[PDB]
C-alpha cells in the first residue's frame, strides 16, 4: 500500500543540485514553488531525468516546443498503460482511451466524440446557461462565501450528470468517484490512499452504469425522445448498440468522460477568479470590452493549466534536449511549465485577457490525445463569465486560497469570494 504523502517544507530550487530536482512532489503547487522549480528546469535541464522519486524514475520535459514534439509523436512515445505519473492500485487499472495508442485509441474516441460535437453542444447551451444564472443568483452578496462548493463544484456536477443522463440527485457520486480515482496517492500524490474504497467505487460504478444503460434502452424501446447524452448516442449507432457486452470499453469510456470533465472544469471556474485577483486591471478591461470573453477563457485556461501534465513511455531510444531518453523510460510532459515558457509566451506569468496567442496554450495538450471536451470546457467558462458580467460589478478574493494536494490536478479547495452587485 503506497504510504500517504505528508507535507514538509519544500526548499528553494537553488539549494538543490540539478539531479536532485524532484517535481513529482504533490505539494509544489500548494507551496508556490512550482514556478521557480520549473523555470530552473527549462533553463538548465529542459529534458531532465530524476532517478530517485516515490513514484519511480522519470523524465521531465518542461519547454513548450519540446512538449509539443513529445505529445505529437505517438510514433515514439506511448500513452499506454497509464498517463498519470505513478501507478494505480494493483487490479484497479481501468482501460481508458486517454491511455491508449492509435489505432484503438481512434476507434474508441470516435465512438464517443459525437457527444461534444458542436451541434450537440448548442442544444446543451440553454440548460448550461439556466443553471449558471440560477447558481449565481443564489449566491450571497453581503458576506464572503466559499466559491468552490457554491459555484465550481455545483455547476460541474450538474454538467457531468447531463453528459450521461445520470440521476440528478446522485450527481455527487460522479464527482466522488472521479476525485478518488484522480487523487490516488499511488498515481498523483493525492490524499486518497484507501484502496478498498477504490474497489468498492469500481463495483458501485459498474452497477450504476449498467443500470443506466438498461434503463435508457428500456426508455428508448418505449419511444422516449433520444437525448443528447452519451448513452443515447451510443445506443443510436450500430457499432455501440451492444457496448454493454464489452464491459472494459463501456465502463472505461464512461469513467474517462466524468474524470476528464470533473476537476478540470471545477478548477478552470475557480482559477479565473484567482487570476482576476492577481491582475485586477484585467477585470476593468473585461467590463469595458466583453467581446474579449472568448479570448479570456483561453487565457484563463492557459494561466491555470488545470491538468499539470500527461505521462508517456518511450517506445524506443529518443534524443531530445541533448539527452537520450531510453526505451521504456517514463516521460512527463509538463503543460504547467510549457504554458509559462517565455520562449513561447511573453510575460508568461501575467494574466492578459487580450493575449494574442492565448489560443496556442497547451493546457489541452496536442496530438491525437488533445482534450476531447475542450469546446465544452470553453463553452462553460464563456457562459459563466457572461453571466458574471450581467450580475456583478466586482469580485474580490478576501482570503488566501487553499490549494489541492496533487502533482496532477492544479486546483483550489477553498476560495473565499466577496461579490459586489451592480
Ligand atoms: C480546461 C478544461 C480541461 C482540461 C484542462 C483538460 C485536460 C486534458 C488533457 C491535458 C488531456 C490530454 C491532452 C494530451 O494528452 O495531449 C485531455 C484529454 C481528454 N479530456 Fe480533457 N480537459 C478539459 C476539459 C474536458 C472536459 C470538460 C471533458 C469531458 C466532457 C474532457 C474529456 C477529455 C477526454 C475524453 C480526453 C481524452 C481524449 C483522448 O485521449 O483522445 N476534457 N484533457
Ligand atoms: C488511478 C489511475 C487513474 C487516474 C485518473 C484517470 C486519468 C485522468 C483522466 C482525466 C484527464 C484530465 O482530467 O485531464
Automatic annotation (TrEMBL):
Cited CDD domains: CYP142-like
Binding site for heme b: 105, 109, 312, 335, 366, 369, 371
Keyword Iron tagged: yes
GO molecular function, one term: heme binding
Xref: Gene3D superfamilies: Cytochrome P450
Pfam families documented for this protein: p450
UniProt keyword annotations, A-Z: Heme, Iron, Metal-binding, Monooxygenase, Oxidoreductase
Cofactor(s) the protein needs: heme
Keyword Cytoplasm applies: no
Family, per entry: Belongs to the cytochrome P450 family.
Full protein name: Cytochrome P450
Amino acid at each position: 500500500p503506497m504510504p500517504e504523502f505528508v507535507e514538509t517544507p519544500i526548499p528553494d530550487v537553488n539549494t538543490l543540485a540539478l539531479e536532485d530536482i524532484d517535481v513529482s512532489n504533490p505539494f509544489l503547487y500548494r507551496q508556490g514553488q512550482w514556478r521557480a522549480y520549473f523555470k530552473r528546469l527549462r533553463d538548465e535541464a529542459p529534458v531532465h531525468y530524476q532517478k530517485n522519486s516515490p513514484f519511480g524514475p522519470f523524465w521531465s520535459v518542461t519547454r513548450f516546443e519540446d512538449i509539443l514534439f513529445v505529445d505529437k509523436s505517438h510514433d515514439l512515445f506511448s500513452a499506454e498503460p497509464q498517463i498519470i505519473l505513478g501507478d494505480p492500485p494493483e487490479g484497479l487499472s481501468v482501460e481508458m482511451f486517454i491511455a491508449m495508442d492509435p489505432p484503438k485509441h481512434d476507434v474508441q474516441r470516435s465512438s464517443v466524440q459525437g457527444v461534444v460535437a458542436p451541434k450537440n453542444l448548442k442544444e446543451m447551451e440553454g440548460l448550461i446557461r439556466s443553471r449558471t444564472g440560477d447558481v449565481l443568483d443564489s449566491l450571497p452578496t453581503d458576506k464572503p462565501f466559499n466559491w468552490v462548493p457554491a459555484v465550481s463544484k455545483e455547476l460541474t456536477g450538474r454538467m457531468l450528470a447531463t453528459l450521461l443522463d445520470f440521476p440528478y440527485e446522485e450527481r455527487h457520486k460522479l464527482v466522488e468517484w472521479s476525485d478518488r480515482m484522480a487523487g490516488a496517492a499511488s498515481a498523483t500524490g493525492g490524499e486518497f490512499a484507501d484502496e478498498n474504497a477504490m474497489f468498492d467505487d469500481a463495483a458501485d460504478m459498474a452497477r450504476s452504469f449498467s443500470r443506466l444503460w438498461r434503463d435508457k434502452e428500456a426508455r428508448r424501446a418505449a419511444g422516449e425522445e433520444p437525448g443528447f447524452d452519451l448513452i443515447s448516442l451510443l445506443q443510436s449507432n450500430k457499432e455501440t448498440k451492444d457496448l454493454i457486452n464489452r464491459p472494459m470499453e463501456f465502463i472505461g469510456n464512461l469513467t474517462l468522460l466524468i474524470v476528464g470533465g470533473n476537476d478540470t472544469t471545477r478548477n478552470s471556474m475557480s482559477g479565473g477568479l484567482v487570476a482576476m485577483n492577481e491582475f485586477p486591471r484585467e477585470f476593468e478591461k473585461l467590463k469595458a470590452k466583453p467581446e474579449l470573453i472568448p479570448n479570456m477563457v483561453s487565457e484563463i485556461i492557459r494561466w491555470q493549466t488545470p491538468t499539470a501534465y500527461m505521462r508517456r513511455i518511450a517506445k524506443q531510444d529518443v534524443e531530445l534536449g541533448g539527452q537520450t531518453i531510453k526505451k521504456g523510460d517514463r516521460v512527463v510532459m509538463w503543460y504547467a511549465s510549457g504554458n509559462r515558457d517565455e520562449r513561447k509566451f511573453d510575460n508568461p506569468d501575467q494574466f492578459i485577457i487580450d493575449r494574442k496567442d492565448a489560443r496556442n496554450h497547451m493546457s489541452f495538450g496536442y496530438g491525437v490525445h488533445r482534450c476531447m471536451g475542450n469546446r465544452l470546457a470553453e463553452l462553460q467558462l464563456r457562459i459563466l463569465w457572461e453571466e458574471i458580467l450581467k450580475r456583478f460589478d466586482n469580485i474580490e478574493v478576501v482570503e488566501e486560497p487553499e490549494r489541492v494536494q496533487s502533482n496532477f490536478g492544479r486546483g483550489y479547495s477553498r476560495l473565499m469570494v466577496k461579490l459586489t452587485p451592480n
